[PDB]
């Protein structure tokens, strides 16, 4: 259950056309997971300050490495990429709750 | 030997080692304000870095 | 005695956006046309001033003095030259640097994104304005069909055409304001391009990964410097390339002969970088329509920033959205195709639907693929 | 403050800035007016028409 709203998507099946588009996008190329190319909002700087040390310390050096090899107009070897599988969502839980904290303090102020 | 060093002998001496040469940089701890190296070899010769 | 603290109670300090400034590593050849922009109005200033001590703003000796330049004036040809290629030059540039920051997402930076739009529209004032100085049958016509336009605007076109005329029609009156105009408003050029930094060094700059560059930031002197050296060569030899080996390939031949307003010319155009928008005028056959479209199409810009939709910042990761940057680049190319001909059947067709594509693609398909991918993202 | 509603802040805030927001648009009317002798809008006035 995934890809397009239509139970099969135009490239057959649903399931896979998430994993083609991941490919695709090509953020795994360059060793970032997918909560490594956020746009850096309000909302989402106040949720990366909120990260363990362990795993803010490593989301740097992810971005570090990126910028590298970006500047050298290059990509990691086959068998550094992120795997679709493998990538986790390490902000989603934090940027959850900073969604619930903004909502009740949006709507408190309208009453 | 230290009886025979003068100002000349220590302008050349220092120029031979010093100027001009490529420097090795260690760095630890808080050294985002570390200059880059280019920075830092420009920094090896005088009017013109 | 200090070193790093040199002499700092002075201009220096504004000088270290310049040399200690932090920029990312991961820098494109794209950015360097920040740079050459700079470049293009230092040199069209210079080029330009050294015109203005032999061009006479008066109708009867307008077209003779620019003659003059070129047949007479030691060395003057290619001065003149300089200045007609580096407009080209300069829209060529300002057209990428308008590109890079729809690719990349630097409309996120509202203030200096906004005073963008603002420089946009000063230039294409100044170059439009400049265009009807040789007063050259090119320069009459083109200027009459343009300016006319303004008489589409209720109940103050009238009013503000002739006040723009200084008369009842382009005349000796129009040409003297638009000389005086054309010197001083690249001065305000200048000014605001000042500001249009002042609000983008206070958030830093962008990279083409789209994501946060701040741990892996660069000193700009030894890096940028050098870049944009080689960048700035690279826009001598291709706006000489044109100068010195093809210099009306761009301008169109009917400039040559002196203007006559009982005479029209085969056909009336603008310059190439104005193409795009004649195209969009052109297709609605109501007057009205057609100055707002026109007006419209190059304000799109200031909406973009609202139509942003997805997660990502750049369009290094967002494959969707590249097949629509390039298709949105070549129907602008297709504008421009169809703006220098002729309007006729092939060609009425061609023009409505590369037009209504024009404000379709922003409009609707551009932020329905950022909520596509969003989708596609698990967010 | 009733169980966090949508927006009813808002209306008060708007409700105090109406009256001078609707004499703040007579300067923009009248000074437009007052700027450029405005034809079909100084002939209602006792005094300048
Ligand atoms: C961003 C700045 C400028 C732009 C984009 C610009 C653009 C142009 C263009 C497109 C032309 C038409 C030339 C042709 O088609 O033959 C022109 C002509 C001219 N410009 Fe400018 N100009 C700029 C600044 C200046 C300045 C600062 C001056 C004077 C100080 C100046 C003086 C002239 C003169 C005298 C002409 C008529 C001579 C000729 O056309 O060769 N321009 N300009
Ligand atoms: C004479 C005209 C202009 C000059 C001299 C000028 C100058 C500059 C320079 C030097 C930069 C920094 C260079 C860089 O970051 O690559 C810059 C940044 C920028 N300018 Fe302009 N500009 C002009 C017109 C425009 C126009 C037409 C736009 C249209 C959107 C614009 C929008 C921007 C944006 C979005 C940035 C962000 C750069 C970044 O994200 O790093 N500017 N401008």
Redesign the pocket.
């Known amino acids: 259950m995934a890809g397009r709203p239509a139970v099969s998507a135009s490239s057959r099946w649903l399931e896979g056309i998430r994993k083609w588009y991941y490919n695709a996008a090509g953020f795994n190329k360059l060793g970032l997971m997918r909560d490594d190319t956020i746009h850096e909002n309000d909302d989402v700087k106040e949720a990366i300050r909120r990260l363990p040390e362990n795993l803010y310390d490593d989301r740097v050096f992810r971005i570090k490495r990126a910028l590298d090899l970006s500047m050298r107009q290059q990509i990691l070897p086959k068998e550094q990429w992120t795997k679709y599988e493998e990538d986790k969502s390490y902000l989603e839980p934090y940027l959850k709750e900073v969604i619930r904290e903004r909502k009740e303090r949006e709507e408190w102020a309208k009453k | 030997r230290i009886a025979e060093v003068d100002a000349r002998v220590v302008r050349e001496v220092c120029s031979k080692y010093f100027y001009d040469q490529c420097p090795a940089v260690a760095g630890f701890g808080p050294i985002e304000q570390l200059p880059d190296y280019n920075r830092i070899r420009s920094g090896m010769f005088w009017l013109r870095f | 005695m200090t070193n790093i603290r040199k002499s700092h109670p002075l201009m220096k300090i504004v000088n270290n956006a310049f040399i200690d400034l932090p920029a990312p590593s991961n820098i494109s050849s794209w950015?360097?046309?920040?740079?050459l922009?700079?470049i293009?109005?230092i040199l069209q200033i210079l080029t330009g001033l050294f015109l203005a001590m032999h061009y006479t703003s008066d109708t009867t000796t307008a077209f003779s003095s620019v003659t003059h330049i070129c047949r007479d004036v030691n060395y003057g040809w290619i001065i003149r030259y300089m200045h007609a290629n580096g407009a080209s030059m300069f829209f060529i540039c300002?057209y990428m640097?308008?590109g890079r920051?729809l690719y990349?997402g630097?409309?996120t930076?509202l203030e200096?994104?906004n005073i963008?739009?603002i420089?946009?529209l000063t230039?294409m004032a100044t170059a439009f304005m400049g265009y009807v100085l040789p007063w050259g049958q090119m320069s009459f016509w083109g200027a009459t069909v343009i300016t006319n336009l303004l008489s589409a605007i209720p109940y103050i076109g009238t009013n503000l055409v002739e006040w723009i005329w200084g008369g009842f029609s382009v005349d000796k009156a129009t040409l003297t304001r638009f000389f005086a105009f054309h010197f001083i408003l690249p001065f305000i050029?200048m000014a605001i391009?000042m500001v249009?930094?002042l609000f983008?060094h206070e958030t830093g700059?962008?990279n083409p990964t789209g994501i946060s560059s701040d741990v892996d930031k660069i000193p700009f002197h030894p890096y940028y410097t050098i870049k944009d050296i080689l960048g700035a060569l690279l826009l001598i030899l291709a706006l000489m390339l044109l100068v010195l080996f093809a210099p009306d390939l761009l301008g169109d031949p009917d400039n040559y002969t002196p203007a006559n307003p009982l005479n029209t010319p085969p056909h009336i155009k603008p310059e190439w970088y104005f193409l795009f928008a004649y195209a969009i005028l052109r297709s609605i056959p109501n007057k009205l329509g057609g100055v707002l479209a026109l007006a419209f199409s190059i304000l799109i810009?200031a909406l973009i920033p609202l139509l942003h939709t997805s997660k990502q910042r750049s369009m290094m990761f967002r494959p969707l959205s590249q097949c629509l940057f390039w298709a949105l680049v070549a129907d602008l190319l297709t504008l421009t195709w169809i703006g220098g001909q002729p309007v006729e059947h092939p060609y009425i067709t061609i023009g409505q639907l590369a037009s209504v594509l024009y404000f379709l693609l922003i409009l609707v398909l551009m932020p329905t693929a950022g909520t596509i991918e969003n989708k596609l993202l698990k967010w | 403050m009733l169980t966090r509603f949508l927006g009813p802040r808002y209306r008060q805030l708007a409700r105090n800035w109406v009256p001078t927001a609707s004499l703040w648009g007579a300067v923009g009317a009248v000074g437009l007016v007052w700027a450029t002798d405005w034809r079909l809008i100084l002939d209602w006035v006792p005094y300048i028409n």
């Open positions: 950015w360097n046309f920040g740079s922009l700079g293009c109005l300002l640097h308008v920051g990349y630097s409309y930076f200096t994104w963008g739009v420089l946009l230039v050029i391009a249009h930094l983008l700059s962008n810009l």
